């Protein structure tokens, strides 16, 4: 449920990075 997460964990080193990276899906 978390596929953006798990892609972002294998090009970063931080999962609250990932996690504010996912946070927003629509670009503003």
Same mark, same amino acid.
């Given at each position: 449920? =978390?596929?953006?997460?798990?892609?972002?964990?294998?090009?970063?080193?931080?999962? =609250? =990075?990932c996690?504010?990276?996912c946070?927003?899906?629509?670009?503003?």
């Open positions: 449920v =978390d596929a953006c997460y798990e892609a972002c964990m294998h090009h970063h080193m931080n999962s =609250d =990075d996690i504010e990276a946070k927003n899906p629509v670009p503003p």
